[PDB]
């Protein structure tokens, strides 16, 4: 009668905590941010490069296509001549200027083998910090032709497709009108700004939508591999820097204050329960889950105080509309805060299973799932050993031919897709006509037919044992009377 | 011997009821209505906008594409010059005129934040009834430039993609020939009829096929979001307003009279069974299903009497062939009647399980499925809590990047597709390269490998218990003799 | 010791029967007939209609596209001017001429409703034999403008997409060169040969490949619905009429004689076993399967004697190379013989399970699968009632919008694909935004989560009962000694 | 206490063996070889053939498209004019010249049937060694018009799509510049080099990337079937011939020496264990797996010594840069070595299950999987008989229409895809509208609903029996005390 009142107290606390958190994650995701990013993407990615071409930005193939993109579709997308400054789609203001930036490697950064020194003169290693070019090159008479260090253009290390590109390099800020920017890009193409030593080219800009009040930090990364070619990549990230403007935003700030108070409450409660039991605490499952929730929530509050709410670059940009707004770090911490927020909300919803042990069937199901975690963990070890064995088989066979097996983690995720049934078997069968079939049939027969059913066998036998033990307990208590 | 005759009586009633209902749902769905809507769709949606373009109506991107559509493909589709008035595909008569209609919002309907009042002048809020513009604008000298209320153009609230658009706005009826309509559309484009304040544009028309006798109420909705862009949408809805023309339609009207008599019979029978048992009635499953069937059938008869069979607008249109036929409400109640009819037919076919308890194995299967509904309901609660937890995780992570996770219900239905195996993992892995993988692998491992098999464990143990209890009952009755 | 010798006798008979049959079905399917049909298909279907168009034959939309096809891509495909008569791909001889044929309906074959008699003048019913036009029309001065009955052009009823088109109609044989055929097709287009009354247009021709010795009977059917539009369809069917040419074909004819002797043997054996047991014969499973095999094999021998080996039209064609070879019936009986042959081979391979009851585990598995057929049949009845209930729900909801739910059998097969995981959920969710989701989630939850696992529960309990009964039998026989 | 030290000894040996092997298979697969092959593929395959065409190399249709490819896209891809010799993508050196090669068949190599000898003059059999043309033809004044035997151009038998093409034929080495090569190809097209007798055309070349130090042996095979048409095929194979250049490659050679020492150790250990037990050795499972690993590793060491490390053709090429480097055999043994390496790594990871029998639950799972292999083998026999029966049904029905059922093994792998849920049901349903549906529904109902669940039933009953036998053993040992 007192434990039920305790569960009532920590339930009427927790449901208010969950309502506050699902209000915050209704205020974060504004209702149609998706259409903003898909209109920006279908403007800059999906449009054809020129009238005489059919390549997108998504399917670039060589470096001349990249010059046609920077001269053509990018300048038709950035500079909408208003029916001054350009409003993209006649709504989205282009903040300041876009910035193009290059990352180079040194000549002779690798090593040509001995018998081929007569033919091939120059080599260029795969991109690294040790291989990076610091020398000025070309006409040397501008910022685009002189190296600039990472701590002098306020950048950060971007994690691209095939490397981790640093924030330094050879930046050139563009201009406010289409004619000045086209003249600067033609001056870069004429003096050869992208040669054999280029390994990455960033195009950074930032737009602002005043209708729904969202920034958008576009980053278009083109990676030139050492193998020759072009790997395009993009990143559209909707910031929200100016909070206080609407009544609902004051409501969200009040819910932020209330959320900080709730996390203070739960941290103090878990410390008071850890002051009693020294280590009779992590031996349960719900106290460890409360540890995970309060650690992720303290990290979320630390990100939202120390990093995201630090709009020095916004007010510093709003003193002159002719520079480049450094919205890189705000977008990076917005991504980190979205990941921490989503994982915190997921474990808060998982925490609800302390409070639906109300019925007898719910107790049977919870006891069943708690008595099979040991044996499912052991079979998860065996299953993942055989699964990573097939993943390394597939990476050694198909790692040079198939997109779905290009890196090792992509081999793992391709095998989860093959288990579910999302196959592109045509490229596997034309990549290797012998082990393609043998890999595929043995992976279907020894996972989806045999090893998949073993998790299910463990769950069957555990559930039958739990139901029979409870029924036999009650039958013994009835035949003892 | 009397209960078997009672089951025989309520079986020879019910099978005639099912034959009447499957005759009605053979007369409703005429055999090839689908090709009529796909030829109308491949005329108006899938055709390229002009000769120099490759955009459809399905893939519009900006507002100039919409003007090229209204000037180009729409007028090549509506006005087939007959080898007067235009027969679409030389079969389908274009009833009257098409109507284009605009929904606007007021200038300054939102609020520009403080530090950006110097740069950005005007804002336009997301569409609502409070934000809607009522002021006349432009040249103000026609119906296209003056607001018209919802109750004065006989419209209704359309439920579009991103809002619930009202029926009011700035309508312009077009004309009978291609030249007059092209002149009116050029007069709209020249005087700027779609500006920054437009939030929706409807294009409504209605065709009639006299060969198979079906109307078709085309509604082409273009939504201009507050973010800038174009979301196209369409709705093709085959009415059938003139019933009595063929012998089979007199047969269908006779089956409608017979169906109303059967529903009178079943309602009186359920009231006579509810007059005996006051509440020893909903404690079963088949009486509650009869309640659901007679409620849905009374609602279907009410829709077919009070709403769908109300062709005042048809006979009112047939006094002058130069106006716009308001076929909005007939199409809306035809959609409602199709949903009620389909759900009524589904629960009538589910009702058949009163009458296939004839064999002993059928009794074993029915007792098995009736003894596991409690435990499958409890595990459905636990499964749906973990499932909605993953859906909110996916909505917070991918809700700004991926089409399949744009809204919350689309996150739920995308997760059902991931469980079945209909994945587009490329866009998930390029949206977020860390939690894309972690979300996907933990959702596969903790649903398709573990929580999916628990429903199956419940069904295994319940079926084994039921078969063993019946076999042990008969063995005890054999060893008692 | 005598039953084992009997099984040895009927095993060394049967394995020779299976080797003969898998030699016949290695001789029937020649090793690369597929590339012959895909080169004919990618010549006539996948090529663009003209240089200024992008439509295939597969994606025709209107009647002017069909005239551009008959004037353009068909005459560039049929008449390869040899580097006389035309060798398609410089290998495949075009036998004789192609024949184009039209099927019409009468004016006023339906009924215009009362209030619309002032506007719409003429109607044309959906195609049937009662609706068919017999009147001569147009200039009336040729075979293309005069009706010809089915028994006077040797045709047969084609089973198209939306009707069952008869063999009669308005045929026009084309000519041997491209210029004469283009002149005849231009004379058809100028005098308007396809008007509002056309319901089907066949294009029949036949090519012969002398390298691998195969005929190919191309039939291109364009169906013009009553709704207006074009439904294209095709049929490529590789005959083989001249048998005796290679040594392997004499070997195949010897295997045909040996197969007729084996079927004589099995029919006499089953009659001798039915003369003993009057009805203690169909009470087993393998005697009924032998009945199915000998009935299908007698039907296969009857088709191969009375119908397929009847090359009167081939030798009758080889007296003049300027007519049309009636290869319709030979292609139809070749399709029927391929279906009978494939089903006979499937049940012959199923018959092999009389002879792998050799081990004790094989006896356990066979007894298990024979003791669960009754209960799986009962649950197959319940499962198919709920499955057809969902299929009729989906046909009433989506039967006017979605290709995958166009007809009722396509609804059934689309639901099997949804169970496996081959979904196009985008068109379902844009067809109906309320019952699309509700139908999809309830079909996943009440099939793939609940009713799918019940077959598995039946198989689990039956296998556990069979293994425990055999183990308990041997334990009782060991504890009785 | 001594067996645990023995397991410790053969575990600290084996984990070092696994670390050495996963270092070798990190050095083999360089981190981004995939982007090198996809840039070569998107240069030579995915580019359009000319400016006025839309065909790739992947979708060739006839022989004039192949001449437009050899004159157009191939010469725009091979000969990048450097901003001498051509650097492809300004990085990849084109080694020497490309070689085009033709395989022909004789006139009259087949047999025209009797009644058609008047019409068709010449036939050409399907390609074989007996059918191959050895006669000189055309102008006869060069290497392109005179037969050259397989042992005089150092080729080997290529295993193409529809045949096994020999290494001989009519080769023509091209030249170093685009003008000379275009002149030679125009001289081949003008004098008709590809006629009716051509059955295959190889285009072989080899590029070298000095940045990441990889060769790439491009082979473009176009197969002209006897049916007329073009089947394109390609093969991109990244060699690595010059080993010693980097510090990591010296580390890899040291790991190769260490791997040869480990395989010497394991072979001597297995021979010492086979000298004790004569045949009490293959009766276990881990000794047979060690046999498989040491046989595959001795074969891998034999391939890497006797075949792959035999760079006579490289140093022989580096004496003159104007010939053709025979990199055929090095690419073939690199493919064989990748397959042997991947399968050896897979069975090494499978060998790890000797050493995770540490816990009691792991012992339960291993005993469970070892007691069900007999019954899963018996049901795998029954399942594969029914599965190959359906595969032969599908090959006889769909083997002339559908790509996914073209050959018999493709029917098997298409059925595994149908079981997982990767269906293209549209082409099956338009190939055969009766047995397409009946085959598909009976294959879903009698595999995914019934026979799939029987493996699972075997695993359920075996796991329940094993857990109950161990629990009953411990309960009997507790009730015996
Ligand atoms: C590149 O480096 C090579 C040697 O490392 C040198 O011979 C060559 O002149 C250099 N070229 C340029 C453009 O720096
Ligand atoms: C120096 O910079 C100017 C831009 O102001 C540019 O036009 C010029 O080309 C540069 N000098 C050389 C030698 O390229
Ligand atoms: C729009 O509103 C702003 C302030 O709300 C005003 O300054 C501006 O003049 C208005 N423009 C138009 C075109 O109404
Ligand atoms: C007034 O309406 C007419 C249409 O009759 C239109 O042509 C004209 O442009 C309108 N007036 C102005 C000032 O736009
Ligand atoms: C078609 O039939 C209608 C009435 O059935 C008639 O008035 C009309 O003249 C006919 N037209 C032709 C072309 O036969
Ligand atoms: C009569 O047939 C000829 C073909 O020989 C055709 O050219 C002509 O057009 C036909 N007559 C009429 C009046 O169309
Ligand atoms: C091909 O062979 C046939 C008979 O086999 C012969 O009549 C014909 O002249 C030959 N043609 C050529 C070009 O060799
Ligand atoms: C002989 O070879 C030359 C190439 O040097 C070629 O141009 C010529 O066409 C050949 N002779 C004949 C008769 O084709
Ligand atoms: Ca699946």
Author numbering:
A (entry chain B), B (entry chain C), C (entry chain D), D (entry chain A): 214 to 296, 305 to 702
Paper text:
Polycystin-2 (PC2) is a transient receptor potential (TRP) channel present in ciliary membranes of the kidney. PC2 shares a transmembrane fold with other TRP channels, in addition to an extracellular domain found in TRPP and TRPML channels. Mutations in PC2 are responsible for approximately 15% of autosomal dominant polycystic kidney disease (ADPKD), which is one of the most prevalent genetic disorders in humans, affecting 4 to 6 million people worldwide. Here we use a combination of MD simulations and cryo-EM to identify and characterize PIP2 and cholesterol interactions with PC2.
To investigate possible binding of anionic phospholipids to PC2, we determined two cryo-EM structures of PC2: in the presence of PI(4,5)P2 to 3 Å resolution, and of PI(3,5)P2 to 3.4 Å. The overall conformation of the protein is the same as our original structure, i.e., a closed state at both the selectivity filter and the lower gate, although we did in this case observe a disulfide bond in the TLC1 region of the TOP domain (between residues Cys331 and Cys344). The two structures reported here also differ from our previous structure in that they both display a spherical density below the selectivity filter consistent with a bound ion. These densities are visible at several thresholds, and the peaks are prominent even in the un-averaged (C1) maps, which indicates that they are unlikely to be noise peaks on the symmetry axis but rather may correspond to bound cations. In particular, we examined the region of the maps where phospholipid was found in the simulations to see whether there was any evidence for density possibly corresponding to tightly bound lipids at these sites. This revealed clear non-protein densities located between S3, S4, and S5 in both the PI(4,5)P2 and PI(3,5)P2 maps, suggestive of lipid and/or detergent occupancy. The density observed in the PI(3,5)P2 complex may correspond to a lipid molecule, although the presumed head group region of the density is not sufficiently well-defined to unequivocally interpret it as a PIP molecule. Although PI(3,5)P2 maps suggest that a lipid molecule may be bound at this site, there are few interactions between the region where the head group lies and the potential lipid. Furthermore, the PIP2 interaction site on PC2 and the PI site on TRPV1 both agree well with the lipid-like density in our 3.4-Å cryo-EM map. Returning to the cryo-EM data, we noted that with the more soluble version of PIP2 (i.e., PI(3,5)P2), we observed in the map a small outward movement (∼2 Å) of the VSLD at the S2–S3 linker region and an inward movement (∼2 Å) toward the central axis of the cytosolic extension of S6 helix in the PI(3,5)P2 structure compared with the PI(4,5)P2 structure (which may correlate with the apparently stronger binding of PI(3,5)P2 seen in the PIP strip assay). This is suggestive of an interplay between occupancy of the PIP2 site and the interactions between the VSLD and pore domains.
